[PDB]
Design an enzyme around this catalytic site. Sequence first.
Site, short mmCIF file in Angstrom:
data_model
loop_
_atom_site.label_atom_id
_atom_site.label_comp_id
_atom_site.label_asym_id
_atom_site.label_seq_id
_atom_site.Cartn_x
_atom_site.Cartn_y
_atom_site.Cartn_z
N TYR A 1 -6.67 1.70 13.38
CA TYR A 1 -7.80 2.63 13.80
C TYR A 1 -7.20 3.99 14.35
CZ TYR A 1 -11.70 4.37 16.64
OH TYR A 1 -12.67 5.43 17.53
N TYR B 1 4.86 -6.44 11.17
CA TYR B 1 3.72 -6.92 10.33
C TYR B 1 2.90 -5.79 9.77
CZ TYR B 1 -1.08 -9.19 9.60
OH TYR B 1 -2.13 -9.75 9.39
#
Lengths: 290, 291
Positions: free
Chosen positions: B109, B135
């Site tokens: 975001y 990740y």
Amino acid sequence: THLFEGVGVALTTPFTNNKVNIEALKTHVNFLLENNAQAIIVNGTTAESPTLTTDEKERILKTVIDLVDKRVPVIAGTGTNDTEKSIQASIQAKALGADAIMLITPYYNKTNQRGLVKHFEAIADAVKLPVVLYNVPSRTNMTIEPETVEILSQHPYIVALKDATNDFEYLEEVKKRIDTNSFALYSGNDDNVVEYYQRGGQGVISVIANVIPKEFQALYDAQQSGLDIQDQFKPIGTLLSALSVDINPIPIKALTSYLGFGNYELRLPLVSLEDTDTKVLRETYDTFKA
Amino acid sequence: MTHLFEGVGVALTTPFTNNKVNIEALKTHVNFLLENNAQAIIVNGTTAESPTLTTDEKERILKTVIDLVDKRVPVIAGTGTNDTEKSIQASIQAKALGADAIMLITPYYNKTNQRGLVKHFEAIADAVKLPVVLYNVPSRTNMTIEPETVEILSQHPYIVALKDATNDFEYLEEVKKRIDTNSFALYSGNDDNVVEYYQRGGQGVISVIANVIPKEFQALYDAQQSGLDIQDQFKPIGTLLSALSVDINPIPIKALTSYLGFGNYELRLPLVSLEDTDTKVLRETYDTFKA
């Protein structure tokens, strides 16, 4: 009938040694109002909302509300990728006195279109305040499909879309499914405004209007009066090109701090531009002003 | 001799019953996983629906899995968000609760550049002093960890693995060119690319489907380590994985975790469950696989 038309500003958060600086915040908002901003969007992406604490968001939002004093709409960014928390946060914004709330689509988790409606409608029903949808697929990797906008626009409380798709095919599919008398389309991308306005947009929710609110609103007003802004835009587009050196709000805050609104600070994971890029961007700004 | 695990780690789903975390269903699920040869439990990841869990729920769940597992396999706590300060604080709390490692997604975001991405991961790793699995999932974050960036981060003593959900084998090879896989582990974050991932020298997978087929999915990894070809052997699992792609994870996998009695079939908004027939089609696809 729309919340506003023309330029709304996605207000940056002024930091000072990592602290929200309320006095700078007030000076910036005053500067925006005195320079013809049509609306203030508070705690949006441009405000670094993801790194703001809840207390911070509330102190900032209450400050903007009490200072604006109903002279223009105060639209609080309250939506996240969690429906329940978006409901809570929207309810607090309402209680603090916001005139509307802005809700981004979910992101990271994402959802399907049917979930999207459930999510937006749940928040709108719970808050009972004008809602501005916010679609930015370059940040969310999902969209509010045109048919989905149609379903949502029929909500009494869902009144607008901040459209940052930069996709004019999409813009035309949305246009033919909504009534723009009651449902406003705002660009969420400063550099598409010439064409966005030509194709009947209601304004823009702007990053660059943090620093050039007067010129950017004046450009809307010229268009609206029946004047061509294609060439008039270029000096702004030149500054917009320099602003694209990094992800927003990393560059815009080099300019808001330059004008005195807080220090040039970003909260991690964001970082400020390096000195060379900062001075190049600030020079570009001074050249625009000259 | 030094990776946290090899083979199949499970990205554990959160079991809901009337929208409350079911602690008994959770314990049962973990035991079922461990009993069926799961090599690691990844707690509060994307699959656990972490964006919608309260901080309290995440802590309760983490402490529950930690105490049950009792150090039998690594408990890997997903603690990373797009706020570095919050990621640091959640990671410190996961270490206090007894997690063996933390998993940190890239920001999303807000995103960041590669420079700030290094500062973000390094500040978390510096603060928590516990093993870190990065990740990378560009389909959810719209950003990446560049192969050069993974190189840089691998040099931190605490940053030890990558869950690589890019599904990009040029990327894999670029990363392999820059890291030592004996000290820096590479786990697929995408169930359907495992045949090639393992074949290309990957250390394992952090798995969605292993929530329901931990035994079979670990046995596929074992088969290939023993020198057997699993290209054809994988296809029955691929069939199950085609059914699972009906919607965005964990919307489908929860149709199956409930079907095995690990909570009800409930997702927290903005997620919603599959409608009834796609729920059944998916459950039958699984029974066919089991049959």
